[PDB]
Write a protein that binds this DNA or RNA. Structure first.
Ligand SMILES: [Mg+2]
Ligand SMILES: [Mg+2]
Ligand SMILES: [Mg+2]
Ligand SMILES: [Mg+2]
Ligand SMILES: [Mg+2]
Ligand SMILES: [Mg+2]
Ligand SMILES: [Mg+2]
Ligand SMILES: [Mg+2]
Ligand SMILES: [Mg+2]
Ligand SMILES: [Mg+2]
Ligand SMILES: [Mg+2]
Ligand SMILES: [Mg+2]
Ligand SMILES: [Mg+2]
Ligand SMILES: [Mg+2]
Ligand SMILES: [Mg+2]
Ligand SMILES: [Mg+2]
Ligand SMILES: [Mg+2]
Ligand SMILES: [Mg+2]
Ligand SMILES: [Mg+2]
Ligand SMILES: [Mg+2]
Ligand SMILES: [Mg+2]
Ligand SMILES: [Mg+2]
Ligand SMILES: [Mg+2]
Ligand SMILES: [Mg+2]
Lengths: 79, 94, 136, 58, 116
RNA sequence: GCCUGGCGGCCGUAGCGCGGUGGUCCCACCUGACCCCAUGCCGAACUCAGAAGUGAAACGCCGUAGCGCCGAUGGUAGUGUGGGGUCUCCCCAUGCGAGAGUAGGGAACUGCCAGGCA
RNA sequence: GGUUCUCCCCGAAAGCUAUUUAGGUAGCGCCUCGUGAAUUCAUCUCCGGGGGUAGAGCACUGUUUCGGCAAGGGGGUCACUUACCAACCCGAUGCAAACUGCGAAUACCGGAGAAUGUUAUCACGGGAGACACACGGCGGGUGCUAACGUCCGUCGUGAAGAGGGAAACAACCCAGACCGCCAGCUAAGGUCCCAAAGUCAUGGUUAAGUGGGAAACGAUGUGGGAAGGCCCAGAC
RNA sequence: UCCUCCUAAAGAGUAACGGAGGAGCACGAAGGUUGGCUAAUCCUGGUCGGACAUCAGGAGGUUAGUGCAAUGGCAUAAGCC
RNA sequence: GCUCAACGGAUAAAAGGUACUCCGGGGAUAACAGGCUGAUACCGCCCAAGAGUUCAUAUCGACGGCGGUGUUUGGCACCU
């Protein structure tokens, strides 16, 4: 027995691509809690303690798949 | 042997195939060998009785068209789910 | 009556019944009985239809069952208000699409398999038709 | 270029907001407006969006 | 086996250096020889190299495969890198312990003037 | 021109299996280890000093379609918009169009530096 | 419960969050008025992007049938036997909201471009109302894929829209009423009379007032199509 | 009151006295860094020892593991010393 | 320093009866009756193992399936 009791506020999944925020490091460009299929491509600064990706300074956001295991990385084109 | 008369299709897709089947005909494809594949249409009433015989999938057919005589062999058949009809036929050159 | 030995979940959503059947060919036996309409098919119905043809042929040939009741069906009691949780499972059913083959037989003549499948269809709720193994 | 005539013909009451926005972009106001628009692929796409209710003369 | 284990050991630093985007001094040690080379930040083009398989360096020692030859090769790499003008390289051990012959070469370069 | 070593691009048409083959150099085995260094015990590994011997293992290369892998055309499923029907499900016009499977392909390609051999 | 003269312009909501709260109230969402502002905002074309839904599939997690091989367990002696069952594995066949080695159409985010739109966009300030929604289409949970049931997502209408059609018939189809005309053309739907307009034209079908309610099933009703056994050297 | 999954219609969000489970802690190392290492399961051989303890080899390649429910992750290891 | 867990937390500090009852409202919400629905109930029909000595259908009829009525027990809360 027992129902309801469902968690709330599952946060967010995708926050943008290309020059959507652009300015500064941002705090989007990541599926929080994901890690897999969303890794730091070196161009953007690594994950946060909760697996959150963010930019360095500026640029477009791009997604690529490369390396063994065919994992997807997010990079930023500095401008 | 078995000889089947066919005509070259001029419009392909879901609607075209459904119209063909509404007109008591059905599409088919001839591929294999070295030539590029070509799509044709056959008449259901005549092809069904011929296919009923178990030799149709055994010996080499003869797809008579406007002077090509490709003599292909039956490769695959798609039939209607719940009634005795033919939806499609894949032929491989031999 | 046929039903799974163990269930990962005891209750399941109603869901819809759309599309055509996937297994539409006579694969195991030589003759088959295949549905033409759509609808539910309960374990009791399957069991009664099985007995029909099994006793029609007594001891001859082999019989296959292609469908299987997988999803449970709930039902709340008679004098009960709406709500207060989901009902309780009462019987198991199999969703069948048009063209689904239900039963097959191999070691029997056509003239006897036809009558056995006629008797089984009399029990079945959905309308069916007799099909032959043929070739690819 | 060549231009084309577009007539509204049918009404826009129970239609989708996207279709009403397409009509606004084409500039049609009422039934039988008969507006003139330059023939370009964008205008052709707009016409195709609401082709079920507009009529083209060319 | 052993080579695969060494590559597994070295991968993390190997690519952390590219994440930082810096020229890296990579050393490959064998029982008979020792090689060193400066790899550009992109990891595709070689700027400088030196080992014990060439006529020079190798013709003026006792036996290739010792700390003295390692120091000689380190001197060679340092001098050639200085000639090319590249500076501020990041040394990588490539899965080898830093205490062995690899201690030399690195020490020789940093005393020569390469900014370890 | 090849052969070898290191660092990359790409991430199975790049893998696995079976057969053959390589030692001038390189590579790996390989000898010893009072020392630098080390084993929850062991020079097995890590590490040091060497070059008597062998390509056996490993590794590189070549052949092979047994498997993995890739994969059309056509048809089918689904679906946006508009319309219709006996409406729990479907049909027509138009646009998009799979998955699976079939024919077939397939025993990788490539950049830089260094060495042996012309 | 009731709230008294006139005209003009615009014009909602019945949602989220909190509530000693649930027929109340507050912030936001929606309406109005004023000021300011960048090519801002909407549609279409092209370009870039993430997905795991429909569908499909069974490598994984579960379930499912058949066939083969065959550990192991067991009946029947003290070490043989087996008319017994059966794990794993291999081949074939299905199913899944809480399965995925696959995977759309739409939708959404961002960039560029033409045209069109009384700025339709955003910010600040004055005034609000509203937080009982209803039905129809599509995708669902619950219920008996029962209810003019109930709970969500999205669109339309009513609410707050008169007019024409469905007989009558808010919520269905066509269509948005500034005023006047003893004017013309149309939409849905219709043209024998009631009652405006074809007792219109051509080719078929139905004998049932079917049309103008209802299934499994039954049947020498009747029209059409593609085949088969039999054959005028004699067929039913 | 809070957390995980489905419902939830491939951006976010989305109700029911809808379908299933957990939390009201723990750790002074179970944190930091450096160095190193790689699992479950099965098969063959061997005293006690056997279905299963430990040892050697071979298959297999994460079906193992995570301080705690579920999802998503993790070989680079986030797993082990 | 609060299991203020009714977890946006009315007080530091709090349980019941009214058939002796009373006021303001509601068909926003139940009981009687109407309405929608037809799960259940009632009636009919389809298949036919079997009973009927022989023999499915003189008379019954297992396991199953399809309908009608609005007619019982129910569901909804549309009217009062
Ligand atoms: Mg107005
Ligand atoms: Mg309220
Ligand atoms: Mg599905
Ligand atoms: Mg409300
Ligand atoms: Mg509502
Ligand atoms: Mg309602
Ligand atoms: Mg009102
Ligand atoms: Mg009206
Ligand atoms: Mg009227
Ligand atoms: Mg009648
Ligand atoms: Mg979502
Ligand atoms: Mg969506
Ligand atoms: Mg909402
Ligand atoms: Mg930890
Ligand atoms: Mg470490
Ligand atoms: Mg740690
Ligand atoms: Mg509260
Ligand atoms: Mg008394
Ligand atoms: Mg009173
Ligand atoms: Mg009421
Ligand atoms: Mg009542
Ligand atoms: Mg009643
Ligand atoms: Mg209500
Ligand atoms: Mg009344």
């Amino acid at each position: 027995g027992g129902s309801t009791r469902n968690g709330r506020d599952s946060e967010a999944k995708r926050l943008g691509v290309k020059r959507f925020g652009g300015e500064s490091v941002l705090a989007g460009s990541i599926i929080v809690r994901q890690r897999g299929t969303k890794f730091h491509a070196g161009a953007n600064v690594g994950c946060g303690r909760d697996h959150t990706l963010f930019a360095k300074a500026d640029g477009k956001v791009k997604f690529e798949v490369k390396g063994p295991k065919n994992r997807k990385f997010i990079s930023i084109e500095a401008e | 042997m078995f000889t089947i008369n066919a005509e070259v299709r001029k419009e392909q897709g879901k609607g075209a195939s459904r119209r063909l089947r509404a007109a008591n005909k059905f599409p088919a494809i001839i591929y294999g060998g070295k030539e590029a594949p070509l799509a044709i249409e056959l008449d259901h009433d005549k092809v069904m009785n011929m296919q009923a015989k178990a030799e149709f999938y055994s010996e080499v057919l003869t797809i008579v068209v406007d002077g090509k005589e490709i003599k292909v062999k039956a490769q695959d058949v798609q039939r209607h789910p719940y009634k005795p009809k033919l939806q499609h036929i894949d032929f491989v050159r031999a | 009556m046929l039903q799974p030995k163990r269930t990962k979940f005891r209750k399941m959503h109603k869901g819809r019944n759309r599309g055509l059947a996937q297994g539409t060919d006579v694969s195991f036996g030589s003759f088959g009985l295949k549905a033409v309409g759509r609808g539910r098919l309960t374990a009791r119905q399957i069991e009664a239809a099985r007995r029909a043809m099994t006793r029609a042929v007594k001891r001859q040939g082999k019989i296959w069952i292609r469908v299987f009741p997988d999803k449970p069906i709930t039902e709340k009691p008679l004098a009960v208000r709406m709500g207060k949780g989901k009902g309780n499972v009462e019987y198991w059913v199999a969703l069948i699409q048009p063209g689904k083959v239900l039963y097959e037989m191999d070691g029997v003549p056509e003239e006897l398999a036809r009558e056995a499948f006629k008797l089984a269809a009399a029990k079945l709720p959905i309308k069916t038709t007799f099909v032959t193994k043929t070739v690819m | 270029a060549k231009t084309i005539k577009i007539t509204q013909t049918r009404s826009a009451i129970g239609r989708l907001p996207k279709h009403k926005a397409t009509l606004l972009g084409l500039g049609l106001r009422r039934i039988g407006h008969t507006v003139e628009r330059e023939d370009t692929p964008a205008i052709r796409g707009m016409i195709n969006a609401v082709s079920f209710m507009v009529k083209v003369e060319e | 086996d052993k080579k695969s284990a060494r590559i597994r050991r070295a991968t993390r630093a190997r690519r952390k250096l590219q994440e930082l985007g810096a020229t890296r001094l990579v050393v490959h040690r064998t029982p008979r020889h020792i090689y060193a080379q400066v790899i550009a930040p992109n990891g595709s083009e070689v700027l400088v190299a030196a080992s014990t398989v060439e006529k020079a360096i190798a013709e003026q020692l006792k036996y290739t495969g010792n700390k003295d030859a390692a120091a000689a090769v380190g001197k060679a790499v340092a001098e050639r890198a200085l000639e090319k003008g590249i500076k501020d390289v990041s040394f990588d051990r490539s899965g080898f312990q830093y205490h062995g012959r690899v201690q030399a070469l690195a020490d020789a370069a940093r005393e020569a003037g390469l900014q370890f």
